Enzyme design. Structure first.
Site, mmCIF file in Angstrom:
data_model
loop_
_atom_site.group_PDB
_atom_site.id
_atom_site.type_symbol
_atom_site.label_atom_id
_atom_site.label_comp_id
_atom_site.label_asym_id
_atom_site.label_seq_id
_atom_site.Cartn_x
_atom_site.Cartn_y
_atom_site.Cartn_z
ATOM 1 N N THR A 69 -3.540 -17.925 21.984
ATOM 2 C CA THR A 69 -2.071 -17.538 21.694
ATOM 3 C C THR A 69 -1.853 -17.518 20.531
ATOM 4 O O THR A 69 -2.371 -18.407 19.854
ATOM 5 C CB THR A 69 -1.258 -18.644 22.582
ATOM 6 O OG1 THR A 69 0.158 -18.421 22.271
ATOM 7 C CG2 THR A 69 -1.501 -20.329 21.940
ATOM 8 N N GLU B 213 0.880 -22.224 27.402
ATOM 9 C CA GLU B 213 0.146 -23.250 27.454
ATOM 10 C C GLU B 213 0.702 -23.970 28.713
ATOM 11 O O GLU B 213 0.100 -25.220 29.017
ATOM 12 C CB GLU B 213 0.604 -24.165 26.258
ATOM 13 C CG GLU B 213 0.082 -24.076 24.940
ATOM 14 C CD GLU B 213 1.111 -22.904 24.236
ATOM 15 O OE1 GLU B 213 1.997 -22.165 24.819
ATOM 16 O OE2 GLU B 213 1.128 -23.086 22.993
ATOM 17 N N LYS C 269 9.543 -11.694 17.964
ATOM 18 C CA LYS C 269 8.818 -11.398 19.286
ATOM 19 C C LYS C 269 9.108 -10.156 19.727
ATOM 20 O O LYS C 269 9.935 -9.665 20.100
ATOM 21 C CB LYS C 269 9.142 -12.534 20.651
ATOM 22 C CG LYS C 269 8.092 -12.346 21.547
ATOM 23 C CD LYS C 269 8.557 -13.294 22.754
ATOM 24 C CE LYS C 269 7.608 -12.978 24.119
ATOM 25 N NZ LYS C 269 6.360 -13.726 23.891
ATOM 26 N N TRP D 30 3.650 -11.637 19.831
ATOM 27 C CA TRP D 30 3.994 -12.651 18.640
ATOM 28 C C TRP D 30 3.762 -12.221 17.528
ATOM 29 O O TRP D 30 2.692 -11.659 16.933
ATOM 30 C CB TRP D 30 3.504 -14.098 19.212
ATOM 31 C CG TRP D 30 4.382 -14.866 19.822
ATOM 32 C CD1 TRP D 30 3.834 -15.356 21.082
ATOM 33 C CD2 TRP D 30 5.670 -15.366 19.760
ATOM 34 N NE1 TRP D 30 5.105 -16.229 21.774
ATOM 35 C CE2 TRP D 30 5.844 -16.202 21.100
ATOM 36 C CE3 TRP D 30 6.728 -15.157 19.023
ATOM 37 C CZ2 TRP D 30 7.200 -16.792 21.082
ATOM 38 C CZ3 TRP D 30 7.851 -15.681 18.807
ATOM 39 C CH2 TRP D 30 8.166 -16.518 20.114
HETATM 40 N N1 LIG Z 1 11.816 -15.760 31.252
HETATM 41 C C1 LIG Z 1 11.993 -16.092 29.686
HETATM 42 N N2 LIG Z 1 13.200 -16.354 29.296
HETATM 43 C C2 LIG Z 1 13.095 -16.592 28.019
HETATM 44 N N3 LIG Z 1 11.985 -16.575 26.926
HETATM 45 C C3 LIG Z 1 10.887 -16.316 27.751
HETATM 46 C C4 LIG Z 1 10.804 -16.077 28.959
HETATM 47 N N4 LIG Z 1 9.304 -16.119 29.464
HETATM 48 C C5 LIG Z 1 8.619 -16.175 28.235
HETATM 49 N N5 LIG Z 1 9.599 -16.450 27.181
HETATM 50 C C6 LIG Z 1 9.216 -16.559 25.959
HETATM 51 O O1 LIG Z 1 8.178 -15.902 25.505
HETATM 52 C C7 LIG Z 1 6.919 -16.907 25.221
HETATM 53 C C8 LIG Z 1 5.649 -16.878 25.703
HETATM 54 O O2 LIG Z 1 4.725 -16.926 24.562
HETATM 55 P P1 LIG Z 1 3.143 -17.655 25.066
HETATM 56 O O3 LIG Z 1 3.066 -17.986 26.441
HETATM 57 O O4 LIG Z 1 2.969 -18.726 24.253
HETATM 58 O O5 LIG Z 1 2.212 -16.514 24.481
HETATM 59 C C9 LIG Z 1 7.578 -18.404 25.711
HETATM 60 O O6 LIG Z 1 7.315 -19.439 24.852
HETATM 61 C C10 LIG Z 1 9.174 -18.203 25.703
HETATM 62 O O7 LIG Z 1 9.716 -18.419 24.457
#
Ligand SMILES: Nc1ncnc2c1ncn2[C@@H]1O[C@H](COP(=O)(O)O)[C@@H](O)[C@H]1O
Ligand SMILES: Nc1ncnc2c1ncn2[C@@H]1O[C@H](COP(=O)(O)O)[C@@H](O)[C@H]1O
Ligand SMILES: Nc1ncnc2c1ncn2[C@@H]1O[C@H](COP(=O)(O)O)[C@@H](O)[C@H]1O
Lengths: 529, 529, 529
Positions: free
Chosen positions: A172, A319, A429, A434
């Site tokens: 990530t 995570e 984002k 990211w």
């Molecule tokens: N349904 C959602 N609503 C708002 N933010 C979301 C949602 N799904 C994912 N995210 C954001 O997208 C990120 C995913 O990043 P990551 O899984 O670490 O690679 C999450 O930490 C959230 O901040």
């Protein structure tokens, strides 16, 4: 490993060979390329196990995969973990330097790479040390994976081992110095499958996944197990359609021709599908998209609800399994008009079975669920990564206080709806990737004449958020936005910066808002510029 | 830790407080900046221990240092390991990206950085996560280290712990994807000190280090403990002179004014010292340089011998302590004329006490020491790194067959003189830094029009070796050497490539020599271009 | 034993086969008997290993040696420990009963005894139980050791084992009921070699041992490893001359004919060498005697300095490695005249590398090093015996308070010179052997008519100290000194008392000085009689 048959281990092989349903003549479809039943899929998995064993893959090895959503990726989701090896999923959308870093960090033994990802490899292939073999994948009979499989028998006795052996890993790029490696075990994946099936299969009449559906992913499938959905589909024995590269027109054709009823995507892809001229003479009234990228906007939700699409939102992250929350509508809320429906369906939702999800302040004090107070979300679940791979300090910061820190600030209603207000950081984002504001700040500060550079994020529809930059020039210094944009673009052209900075939209200012202490007021700046 | 006083542990504190000799009024000199006796040096070490304890440094922490050769670096060589913490020595000559990678990999808690290295930090400071405090060092009373020390008492009871606790670490950029981390324990450093003192102190009349010498390093002191020499000097209680930044004229002034008799450097620095006009009216007949960078050329050795300099060569590397070999002349060889003297003094030398050093082929078969057969050197010693930090496959390749693989091809005479013929790779070494030919090949292959790029090395005097590149152009493509040189320079300007590529000296060709298999004949190419 | 080659063990085989220098054509000389190079010495060591293996000597066995200083003893110093067995060194100057006790206590399996020590064996051979084989050594071709060696091959693969396995043992007759057994490991011997080489090889111009010396011992070689010097010499690869039985004239002939430059002895032997008429027409200006028996007198030091002998004193004992202290002269002290030189060279000296050496009172309170206050010396070093073999209470008294108790009372100057004032007991030391005053007191008290017997010590030159006895007769009892002298001699004739009581010099008195409590004032008696 000492079996002790009375002692049952939760393994992915039990997920494949002890499903909820198994129809040997159900299909697996790779868009306009291939079709084959479930029986041949099982045979192919056993053949792939034989081939991997012949290549010299042992129980501790790592096999990395770099390709699109296809039947081969589904076969890799099963064969590699079942042999006891570790499946490293490579994010093809990262910069070549980051990809090389992740490959070196994970120490992959074999790499299965698609033909059209070869150029990315060609500019890092020299600096790769651990890799011994490359298997080049193609969409025709020339594929090396296909030729490897057909030299092997369809018989294989899969081992049984401890359920705590690691199955999958991926990196990530959430804001940090370098990408962080997460990993899950067989037990965690099996429990995620069972728990989410219990949560979304038992819904009364809305937003349910059942044994009569036809499933097609629209999530890149190297992003956290495609939200776990390919494992669930295999468990239910439903027809699965894999589109390959995401093209709106071919995706719509697949939806129409294969009668797809269940999919998942991010808001950008849904907007593109709805904006396509081919999507005006189609019947969308059988489709159940789950939107989980980020903050499904209410306008898009309303626009989708008028097409008779069962659109609902979910929440997770890299995570966390990923799934942590899903919106489920009670039968009283199913009769509200389109506006209140759009408001409800765009929330992050209620937590799924076996999830705790408290809201907390910076002192680890649990705030009340009054509906307006905001704090960071901290979770406990059966499918959380215990730490970051080969990391100590960030691992400790991840599990501070006995809970996993999500990094999102939200408030929780009385009935349990969660609404994320912001992040605990000033990070951007762009679409589904990211990008770090601090790194862009540093890169722009490396310019010939710069006084103060602060990067904030602004919302968008085709991208969800754009990385606005605010730059203050030096004494008697005048450089146009084109200069700084090209300067930033040069770094991306060297493989240092991700392509999501190609719409930076820099802006020249002369006054920077600062707090009483003097810190840049990024919220006030966002309300200003 | 349970002491058991009868059970003796070999610790660096025993090296400082149980020396061979201790004169409280012997001096420590920082060039034209500071002077203080050994008693104040011990007091300062105890004060620095108190300050580090106050900062919250525990027994498992890492403290990183980034500065020049000075009294502060000598204090860090002792205080940080004696507290039980780990001293990470940062190579300031690496590119900023590599420096950031090493900082993140080692997970440093505190950083002690010199003022004039601040710009390098400023372009990576954003992407550093683990660091909690920066101490900025200056050469005046404004230094933060000096102000930290003077708030503390000169009393401290140093702990006793296991002798196998790690003391130091630093990263070697020998050809690989990323820098590799080596580390040594207290026991290994103490044994290296004792063994080399036994080897070079017991020589009859030539090339010996004894208690009457005055020592001044000319090795950067972040390169493998300055060959262990600062530890040895402290053990002997001799006068130590630290020059700071290497400038030939100030170095010569220090040599003359302080009566320096023992030093160590690389061939480039010696050539610069001899070529300085200030070095014609000086008396060099008391000085005992040890040349250990790479392949002391016979011409430079002869030029130094006519100045009455006891010049001899030694062999080591980052993974090996470093010292593995030193040339010692028997009293019969001390009466040969200048030419045979120059031939003998330029060899790599005989192995030191407690070193095995066999010569082996690719099948691990020990070749005879007939004087002409060549093979890779494999060693066993009490001060070798057991593996690379946070690494498995490269670690296994390092200790393949039960011996440490140096990566150098040499032949061994009947009496035991070792002569290194080449490397087991096609890698370049500009001055005292490592540069990878494969990475340059890839970078140049990323050009608009390139057919085949092969990088070889050619010898030099002011640099020891230059990274020649041979490029074959495409059909109807004509680009000057300036174009490719600037293209390569652009990468260096972004912090990706080390500055040692600024003298690449590219060359345009049209025919590439290839073997029967077809591999580029780099030896034949070197004999060709 | 699991090797783990990266884990380095400090073994005596590494001392023999990884030296500082190795010249295959350097000589080993056994006085007027034998000469052979270092290559044949290595071959002989391997042959002796083969012979011992054939005899059935395993890794836990003990082999005892009883002979003079010769090449065979040097071979035993290496072969027996390298096989993993234990070398028990027998003090041939003890009484037969004590020798038998030590043999039974150590449980030797094989005994290598010289021909001319056979009579001593003949009067104890009946009471020996553990011994299975005797090898009789001679100075001609009739030797059984020589015949055993020549039946064996010169090839042998020496094992590698833990560095904490015991290598050597010998028994100290320091005042106690019975002799006490000390023992050292491979690690301790290797570290003693390295540390003393570092200490005495790095001296500027005086009293140094280097690779150009020729070494001849004059210490019996069963007394604590001959002060470790034979191990050091082998490490340096210098010419070694072994004299055999100590005869002043043949010793002088060897010194002259072989050009010996480094030796060690006790004051008695040096006095005998200087008093020999053959020592008036000799050139002594290349010789570097180390005097370490006891309290090198200043008169003898002055007498030696006028012959141009680099005479210096050292301090150690059976439990301590032995070496703990050596006198080293700074270049300013090298220009003092003969009287101040004699004063400085006769001190016990400064402590060697890695030695602590505090001065303490009976309550374990560290006294100041003001130069006049006196206390017992307590030491910590890497080469101290952890306890006495098969003993508990004396072992605890040896390491009381976490330090090793030497049993000598001294004062330490500001610069670090140590001067031993006396012992913590009323014990005598005739020449180089220990004799107990309490046992003589008891034996004399077993006389027909005795009132009070108190034994004190008085200084001497040919003996260093004589065991004066003061006897008070009973009422109307008159026995001459001859009677009591013969009575004491009778015990010695039975093998009970050591031969050092043959110069008891009894004295008849009538008043015994007694303290306020009433204890005999042995210091006042010494000042009286
Ligand atoms: N349904 C959602 N609503 C708002 N933010 C979301 C949602 N799904 C994912 N995210 C954001 O997208 C990120 C995913 O990043 P990551 O899984 O670490 O690679 C999450 O930490 C959230 O901040
Ligand atoms: N005396 C020498 N002669 C020849 N090559 C040398 C000598 N000292 C160092 N080198 C080379 O310089 C390298 C040091 O690189 P490293 O210690 O790994 O950072 C060694 O591996 C050798 O190849
Ligand atoms: N240089 C010296 N000066 C004074 N006494 C010494 C010296 N070397 C040895 N001794 C004495 O001789 C003793 C040796 O006896 P030991 O080693 O136990 O068999 C030591 O304990 C000292 O008391």
């Amino acid at each position: 490993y000492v079996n002790d048959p009375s002692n049952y281990q939760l393994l992915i092989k039990n997920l494949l060979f002890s499903p909820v349903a198994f129809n040997p003549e159900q299909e697996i479809v790779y868009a306009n390329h291939r079709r084959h039943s479930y029986k041949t899929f099982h045979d192919r998995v056993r053949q792939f196990a034989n081939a991997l064993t012949k290549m010299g893959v042992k129980k501790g090895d790592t096999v990395a995969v770099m390709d699109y959503d296809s039947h081969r990726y589904l076969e890799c989701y099963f064969a590699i973990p079942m042999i006891g090896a570790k499946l490293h999923m490579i994010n093809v959308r990262l910069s070549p330097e980051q990809i090389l870093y992740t490959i070196d960090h994970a120490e992959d033994d074999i790499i299965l790479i698609h033909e059209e990802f070869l150029p990315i490899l060609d500019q890092i292939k020299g600096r790769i040390d651990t890799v011994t073999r490359y298997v080049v994948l193609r969409d025709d009979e020339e594929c090396e994976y296909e030729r490897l499989l057909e030299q092997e028998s369809t018989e294989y006795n899969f081992p049984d081992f401890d359920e705590n052996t690691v199955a999958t890993t991926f990196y990530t790029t959430g804001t940090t110095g370098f990408p962080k490696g997460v990993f899950f075990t067989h037990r965690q994946l099996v429990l995620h499958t069972m728990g989410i099936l219990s949560t979304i299969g038992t819904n009364a009449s809305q937003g349910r996944l059942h044994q009569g559906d036809i499933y097609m992913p629209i999530t890149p499938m190297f992003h956290v197990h495609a939200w776990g959905l390919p494992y669930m589909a295999t468990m239910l024995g439903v027809k699965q359609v894999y589109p390959g590269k995401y093209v709106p027109d071919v995706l719509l054709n697949l939806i129409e021709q294969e009668k797809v009823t269940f999919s998942h995507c991010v808001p950008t892809i849904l907007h593109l599908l709805l904006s396509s001229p081919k999507s005006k003479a189609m019947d969308f009234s059988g489709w159940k998209v789950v939107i989980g990228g980020a903050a499904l906007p209410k306008a898009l939700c309303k626009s989708a609800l008028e097409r008779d699409i069962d659109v609902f939102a979910g929440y997770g992250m890299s995570e966390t399994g990923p799934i942590l929350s899903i919106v489920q509508l009670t039968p009283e809320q199913l009769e509200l008009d389109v506006d209140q429906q759009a408001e409800y369906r765009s929330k992050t939702g209620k937590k799924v079975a076996l999830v705790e999800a408290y809201i907390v302040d910076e002192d680890m004090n649990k705030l009340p669920h009054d509906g307006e107070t905001a704090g960071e979300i901290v979770v406990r679940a059966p499918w959380l990564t215990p730490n970051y791979y080969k990391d100590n300090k960030n691992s400790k910061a991840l599990w501070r206080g006995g809970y996993l820190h999500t990094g999102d600030v939200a408030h929780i209603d009385d009935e349990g709806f969660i609404k994320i207000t912001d992040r605990v950081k000033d990070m951007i984002k762009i679409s589904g990737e990211w990008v770090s504001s601090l790194e862009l700040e540093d890169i722009l500060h490396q310019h010939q004449s710069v006084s103060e550079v602060a990067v904030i994020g602004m919302p968008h529809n085709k991208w969800g958020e754009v990385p606005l930059a605010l730059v203050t020039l030096k004494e008697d210094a005048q450089v146009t936005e084109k200069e700084l944009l090209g300067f930033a673009k040069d770094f991306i052209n060297k493989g240092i910066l991700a392509r999501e900075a190609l719409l930076l939209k820099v802006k020249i200012v002369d006054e920077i808002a600062k707090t009483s202490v003097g810190k840049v007021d990024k919220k006030e700046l966002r309300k200003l510029h």
